[PDB]
Nucleic acid binder design. Sequence first.
DNA 1: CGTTAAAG
DNA 2: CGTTAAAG
Lengths: 59, 59
Amino acid sequence: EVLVVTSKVKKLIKEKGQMNTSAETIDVLSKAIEQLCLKGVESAKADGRKTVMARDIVI
Amino acid sequence: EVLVVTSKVKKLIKEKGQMNTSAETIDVLSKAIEQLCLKGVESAKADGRKTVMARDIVI
DNA sequence: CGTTAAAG
DNA sequence: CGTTAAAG
């Protein structure tokens, strides 16, 4: 379910912008990781590989 | 440094694609979270808010 | 040691 | 910020 380290995302946002982070922001970041991983699976399989690589995460 | 839950990203990729996940893939996912959070800070500040919200993470 | 509760 | 879970 939760694919981001909430404490570290909040520490980064507080330190860089002096701002809080909503529960829903954490949810969007987790869903974003999920979709990157699933599209990374498609890309590695399309190339016949058994490993998702950095080049499979299109950003 | 590491903003993704590595064990859960690897579990997701293994379960969904029967594939391994490279060290460099985890690094790209962490860098992707970092850039989303920093762009989220810019968006919330531009709107004069003290909270990064779901609508500040443009995907 | 990051997450979840709830003491101060 | 101490307690409760569970990632590393």
